[PDB]
Design a protein around this ligand. Structure first.
Ligand SMILES: C[S@+](CC[C@H](N)C(=O)[O-])C[C@H]1O[C@@H](n2cnc3c(N)ncnc32)[C@H](O)[C@@H]1O
Ligand SMILES: C[S@+](CC[C@H](N)C(=O)[O-])C[C@H]1O[C@@H](n2cnc3c(N)ncnc32)[C@H](O)[C@@H]1O
Lengths: 322, 335
């Protein structure tokens, strides 16, 4: 842990001199050549055991961050505050069709559905198990409210349109932001909104690709080249959607989230070893998936804490059609 | 406000002004900078949505004087100094070329220029590409006729100047290219502006826009405390100092194709050049002014304003090596 925090504060500082430039002309230009580059990519590049997440992620199994109001906010609680923020900032109304892109394990689909029994809430994931699990909760807590399409978002067509489209933690897997925002806009209703949240740097976007030959990080964690977006970056993909509002949250909310994920992991470790040996068929491999998750949490709760959250952070954009 | 009174009578040094203007800049930068990006972003966004409910815009100098103060094109907007030893004349010409390149001007296109002014950019484009029909748009009577006389001087059946306020111009002509160089600074509600202009863009047309801005935050010109001479001395009459980024939020009728900024060094240097040529001919601007305005005192009054205005903004644009106040250029396609 200790050395890894250190081995990651150095990765941070060299990603920090990478992307910062001494004048606004150079800074801005770099970001505008970056966006144009992602128009030369595909829309997106072309399975975690459920027992293990009941431990690491908390009640709703929200595999994305939460709003911590103070550092006594439970991880459980933070998950709730964040998704009411979502619901508040998406201007969600009782009775409107809701589409939830990349449900995961439905933490938001079930939230809206329970908080607004008038809304018909439709979710989309590419996992058979996420779908079944979710539809298990509907069963349990009496929801004729939900629907789970099974389809890869980047493939899905439909005639159906939606009063409010959600899409959180999803941009992180998309290369061409243009084709993505292009497709989703034909799913927007007469006068509807689209809610995008996304990890980012405050100031510059970039590919997940080695700084040195001596930065283990980009290889161990990312293993494929993703894009760490820039907070403002979606302002440049406004051809089929228009920005209505734009917010950001300090990087202390992810940093705290990762902090919660690591402690519960480490509080229940024996059970974690047991679940991952059943699943990966080996004490060596379990002992190495434990390592990953700890390193991911440690490193990234240190990556987001940077400069009291004023480097990497959460970014929220609200959209309307055309 | 007796300050102004003695400011006119010459008692206040050019470095007191530059001195007071530095404290103005410090106050404005303390006011506008938030400590978290969440706040800063929500400063701008609220200020941006604020503009959406205003009017587009709210409801004249001697030519011998601009001839003196300004370059031989009379560009009343900034120039591009590759170097400190670049001249006003070249700075101008460098800047309009830059425009002619960033707006993808080709021979043959039709060009709509909005707030053409005394025509520096209209005539630049028109002499350079005989293939374009260029339409200028100003509301000054003097400005139409001047350009129309320089069109006789240069022999170019290549220009057209319509006398109208942009804010109320109604047409169904479309032009492959449109400039709005140093114009949005007269406007407040950019949405309703950008919507009007967007009907003037032809299929695959391009609009090009320049505006003075601060790098980060935007703001109305209202006095900071009650020690703020500069605000209501320099401005009538609430205008809005845009943000670099602010026009990323006005993308309902036009899309963005590119976006650049230029250091506040260029506008800093021009204003410096404006002062020198004005001061290397003070007596000629005195005559020109004591003749035009009707008295030696409003002469005094208006010669002071311009020395003040050249000195404050030149100081203001130099803050932090050109990285607070600054130029934003944005190129749009018809959404
Ligand atoms: C990686 S995110 C995080 C989970 C979710 N955003 C949340 O906050 O609960 C999105 C989720 O949607 C699914 N997903 C990811 N990419 C997808 C794609 N291209 N098409 C469909 N589902 C996808 C994944 O199974 C993943 O759990
Ligand atoms: C210095 S700028 C643009 C001209 C500059 N010479 C150039 O092309 O770089 C300011 C100009 O805005 C124009 N303007 C402001 N409000 C206007 C309006 N409502 N209608 C027409 N022109 C307007 C004025 O004529 C003024 O010359």
């Amino acid at each position: 842990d200790e050395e890894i925090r250190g081995m990651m504060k150095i990765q941070v500082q060299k990603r920090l001199k990478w992307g910062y430039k001494p004048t606004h002309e150079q800074q801005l230009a770099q970001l505008v050549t970056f966006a144009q580059s992602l128009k030369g990519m595909e829309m997106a590049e072309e399975e975690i055991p459920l027992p293990f997440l009941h431990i690491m992620c908390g009640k709703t199994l929200k595999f994305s961050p939460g709003y911590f109001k103070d550092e006594s906010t439970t991880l459980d609680e933070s998950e709730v505050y964040m998704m009411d923020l979502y619901c508040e900032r998406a201007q969600i109304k009782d009775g409107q069709s809701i589409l939830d892109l990349g449900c995961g394990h439905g933490s938001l689909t079930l939230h809206v559905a329970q908080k607004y029994r008038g809304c018909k809430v439709t979710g989309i994931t590419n996992s058979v198990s996420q779908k079944e699990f979710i539809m298990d909760q509907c069963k349990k807590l009496d929801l004729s409210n939900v629907e789970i399409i099974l389809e890869d978002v980047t493939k899905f067509e439909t005639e159906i349109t939606y009063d409010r489209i959600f899409a959180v933690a999803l941009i992180e897997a998309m290369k061409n932001y243009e084709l993505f925002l292009k497709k989703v806009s034909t799913w927007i209703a007469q006068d509807g909104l689209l809610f995008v949240e996304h990890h980012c740097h405050k100031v510059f976007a970039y590919q997940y690709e080695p700084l040195d030959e001596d930065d283990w990080y980009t290889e161990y964690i990312f293993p494929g080249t993703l894009v760490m977006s820039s907070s403002s970056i979606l302002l440049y993909f406004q051809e089929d959607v228009s920005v209505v509002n734009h917010w950001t949250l300090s990087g202390k909310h992810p940093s705290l989230g990762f902090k919660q994920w690591l402690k519960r992991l480490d509080d229940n470790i024996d059970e974690v070893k047991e679940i991952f040996e059943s699943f990966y068929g080996s004490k060596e491999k379990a002992m190495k998936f434990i390592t990953y998750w700890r390193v991911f949490c440690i490193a990234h709760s240190q990556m987001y804490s940077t400069n009291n959250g004023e480097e990497w952070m959460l970014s929220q954009v609200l959209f309307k059609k055309k």
